[PDB]
Design a protein around this motif. Structure first.
Motif, PDB file in Angstrom:
ATOM      1  N   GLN A 170      66.054   6.208 -32.416  1.00 14.29           N
ATOM      2  CA  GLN A 170      65.041   6.400 -31.386  1.00 14.29           C
ATOM      3  C   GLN A 170      64.312   5.094 -31.132  1.00 14.29           C
ATOM      4  O   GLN A 170      64.016   4.766 -29.978  1.00 14.29           O
ATOM      5  CB  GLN A 170      64.047   7.492 -31.772  1.00 14.29           C
ATOM      6  CG  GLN A 170      62.832   7.545 -30.852  1.00 14.29           C
ATOM      7  CD  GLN A 170      61.749   8.474 -31.377  1.00 14.29           C
ATOM      8  OE1 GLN A 170      61.983   9.271 -32.296  1.00 14.29           O
ATOM      9  NE2 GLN A 170      60.564   8.392 -30.782  1.00 14.29           N
ATOM     10  N   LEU A 173      65.793   2.410 -28.849  1.00 12.32           N
ATOM     11  CA  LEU A 173      65.881   2.705 -27.421  1.00 12.32           C
ATOM     12  C   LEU A 173      65.338   1.526 -26.629  1.00 12.32           C
ATOM     13  O   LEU A 173      64.229   1.058 -26.876  1.00 12.32           O
ATOM     14  CB  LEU A 173      65.135   4.006 -27.071  1.00 12.32           C
ATOM     15  CG  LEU A 173      65.133   4.334 -25.576  1.00 12.32           C
ATOM     16  CD1 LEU A 173      66.563   4.472 -25.028  1.00 12.32           C
ATOM     17  CD2 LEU A 173      64.313   5.592 -25.321  1.00 12.32           C
ATOM     18  N   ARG A 183      70.788   1.467 -26.763  1.00 13.82           N
ATOM     19  CA  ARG A 183      70.031   1.382 -28.000  1.00 13.82           C
ATOM     20  C   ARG A 183      70.437   0.070 -28.641  1.00 13.82           C
ATOM     21  O   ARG A 183      71.627  -0.169 -28.886  1.00 13.82           O
ATOM     22  CB  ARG A 183      70.314   2.579 -28.911  1.00 13.82           C
ATOM     23  CG  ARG A 183      69.938   3.925 -28.246  1.00 13.82           C
ATOM     24  CD  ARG A 183      70.169   5.148 -29.149  1.00 13.82           C
ATOM     25  NE  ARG A 183      70.000   6.386 -28.383  1.00 13.82           N
ATOM     26  CZ  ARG A 183      68.821   6.914 -28.047  1.00 13.82           C
ATOM     27  NH1 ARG A 183      67.678   6.349 -28.439  1.00 13.82           N
ATOM     28  NH2 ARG A 183      68.787   8.019 -27.324  1.00 13.82           N
TER      29      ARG A 183
ATOM     30  N   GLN B 170      65.571  13.822 -27.922  1.00 15.20           N
ATOM     31  CA  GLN B 170      66.601  12.859 -27.578  1.00 15.20           C
ATOM     32  C   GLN B 170      67.317  13.292 -26.315  1.00 15.20           C
ATOM     33  O   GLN B 170      67.560  12.477 -25.434  1.00 15.20           O
ATOM     34  CB  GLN B 170      67.615  12.684 -28.718  1.00 15.20           C
ATOM     35  CG  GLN B 170      68.769  11.789 -28.315  1.00 15.20           C
ATOM     36  CD  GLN B 170      69.899  11.740 -29.366  1.00 15.20           C
ATOM     37  OE1 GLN B 170      69.739  12.198 -30.501  1.00 15.20           O
ATOM     38  NE2 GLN B 170      71.044  11.172 -28.976  1.00 15.20           N
ATOM     39  N   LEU B 173      65.781  12.617 -22.954  1.00 13.59           N
ATOM     40  CA  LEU B 173      65.682  11.237 -22.470  1.00 13.59           C
ATOM     41  C   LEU B 173      66.192  11.121 -21.028  1.00 13.59           C
ATOM     42  O   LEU B 173      67.299  11.533 -20.700  1.00 13.59           O
ATOM     43  CB  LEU B 173      66.441  10.270 -23.385  1.00 13.59           C
ATOM     44  CG  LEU B 173      66.472   8.803 -22.929  1.00 13.59           C
ATOM     45  CD1 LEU B 173      65.088   8.229 -22.804  1.00 13.59           C
ATOM     46  CD2 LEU B 173      67.322   7.970 -23.878  1.00 13.59           C
ATOM     47  N   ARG B 183      60.810  11.218 -21.008  1.00 15.83           N
ATOM     48  CA  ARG B 183      61.560  12.352 -21.520  1.00 15.83           C
ATOM     49  C   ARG B 183      61.131  13.523 -20.679  1.00 15.83           C
ATOM     50  O   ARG B 183      59.937  13.797 -20.573  1.00 15.83           O
ATOM     51  CB  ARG B 183      61.276  12.599 -23.004  1.00 15.83           C
ATOM     52  CG  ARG B 183      61.559  11.367 -23.892  1.00 15.83           C
ATOM     53  CD  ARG B 183      61.461  11.634 -25.391  1.00 15.83           C
ATOM     54  NE  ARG B 183      61.625  10.370 -26.112  1.00 15.83           N
ATOM     55  CZ  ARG B 183      62.798   9.817 -26.410  1.00 15.83           C
ATOM     56  NH1 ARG B 183      63.936  10.446 -26.114  1.00 15.83           N
ATOM     57  NH2 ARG B 183      62.830   8.650 -27.037  1.00 15.83           N
TER      58      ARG B 183
HETATM   59 CL   LIG Z   1      65.735   8.647 -27.884  1.00 18.89          CL
END
Ligand SMILES: [Cl-]
Ligand SMILES: CCc1ccc(-c2[nH]nc3nc(-c4ccc(C(=O)O)cc4)cc(C(=O)O)c23)cc1
Ligand SMILES: CCc1ccc(-c2[nH]nc3nc(-c4ccc(C(=O)O)cc4)cc(C(=O)O)c23)cc1
Lengths: 242, 242
Positions: A170, A173, A183, B170, B173, B183
């Motif tokens: 995360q 990102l 990423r 996630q 996103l 998000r």
């Molecule tokens: Cl993420």
């Protein structure tokens, strides 16, 4: 299976620079680079080391989560964005070295060496100050070795919790839109010649992931933007992004 | 605690539309909207319901992880992107109802009703087909209520595992760059009047997060892109994004 595509060298010289981009097609298990030899040349990871360093700290409990605040220590350093409070997200975003040195000291060379070895990371050699070895010590890693490591991280295969891995991904990102997700982690190795810039990570598409690792000669901080710019030119040429 | 700013209504009437945007400054715990009344009018969540539905499917095991594939059933539907294989990431991105309908049937009204009650989600009422109630059944939720739910998700305070919550975030996103992270989840409610479009989620900044929930009258699918466009115009006006 590797393939050399020296045409990519055009993107380096257009900015009168030198370096290597390595791509790995995860679906095809195939690799591509402009320079097979530089692709295997080992360098200090510099701030790309914030990836395993974050992984370690999280799994030990040095960092509890990505919201945990690490307060500025009041020391005014040369990069403005370092002089403020950070959590794991912004620390990785702005490559805030002092925050990660502090993590390193808490990790300690004992657990650090153990973990890197478990990670099969670079030359696994943490020789030097336990809070500056990735910037001026004996750890070394090549672009191809970066992609090996990142692929484990991507698949949650590293010998750490799924959670730590999820959190670090995360924090990696960098860019996201309807076409792709990046990423990644930048690096700038200045303390020891040759001075180089790093950009390593991967591009998530709907149906594939391309891993990448690039480094380039970086005599002055002024050309740091080229790390992303040239990689993207390579990514665009190979039709991975628009 | 709440301020109405009907100047925002310009961004709606620049596209001959009407709707509401609701913003929540998490640091200051203060809310903003162009229309207090419509902010609290409840509608079908439609595909915004993919957020709780994913959390539930994950937390029980209907979905193992974000990589698991759900193969096309060969039934050709109106949305081209639906007629293909999907994982959790792409089914969210493209709002592939059939994949979530299958989730629902595996979920079953008993466990569904339970979870939505534990989530305090909208009117917590799943009257209708167990595999279509969020599109044409009894569930209703307002923009302000969307925000209540989303803040729990953001803080990992919902009654599912941390893992489930991290995975869905996630999958939410939508956009990321050096300035912000979005998000979010889109929604189109077409089966029952009034036809409305949804966009709900949050904008992560370095040191704050802005939650948002917006909905607007959507006669035809041609205006759908206005869901993101009008929101971003409001975010720009409020200096949240560049
Ligand atoms: Cl993420
Ligand atoms: C030990 C004495 C000393 C003091 C300061 C520095 C130093 N100046 N500017 C630095 N910029 C970075 C950096 C830049 C970009 C990225 C990036 O990824 O974009 C990362 C790090 C790092 C250092 C460093 O401390 O090694 C920098 C170096 C040595
Ligand atoms: C049961 C009869 C029937 C058959 C098909 C549809 C139907 N056509 N096109 C639909 N598009 C969406 C959708 C669009 C955008 C977004 C978006 O978020 O962008 C989501 C869903 C949904 C449906 C639906 O089945 O409800 C659609 C509607 C009713």
């Amino acid at each position: 299976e590797w393939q050399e595509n020296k045409s990519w060298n055009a993107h380096f010289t257009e900015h009168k620079s030198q370096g290597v981009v390595v791509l790995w097609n995860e679906n095809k298990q195939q690799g591509f680079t402009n320079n097979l030899k530089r692709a295997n040349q080992a360098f200090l990871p510099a701030s790309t080391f914030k990836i395993p360093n974050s992984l370690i700290a999280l799994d030990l409990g040095v960092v509890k989560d990505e919201h945990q605040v690490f307060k500025w220590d009041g020391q005014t350093r040369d990069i403005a964005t370092w002089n403020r409070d950070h959590n794991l997200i912004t620390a990785m975003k702005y490559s805030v070295v002092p925050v990660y040195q502090e993590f390193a000291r808490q990790i300690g060379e004992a657990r650090m060496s153990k973990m890197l070895h478990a990670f099969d990371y670079g030359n696994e050699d943490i020789s030097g100050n336990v809070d500056s070895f990735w910037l001026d010590g004996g750890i070394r890693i090549s672009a191809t070795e970066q992609i090996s490591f990142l692929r484990k991280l991507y698949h949650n295969k590293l010998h750490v919790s799924e959670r730590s891995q999820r959190i670090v991904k995360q924090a990696m990102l960098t860019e996201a839109n309807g076409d792709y997700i990046i990423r990644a982690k930048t690096g700038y190795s200045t303390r020891i010649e040759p001075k180089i810039g790093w950009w390593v990570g991967w591009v998530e598409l709907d149906d594939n992931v391309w891993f990448f690792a690039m480094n380039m000669d970086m005599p002055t901080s002024d050309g740091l933007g080229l790390r992303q710019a040239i990689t993207k030119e390579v990514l665009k040429q190979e039709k991975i992004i628009p």
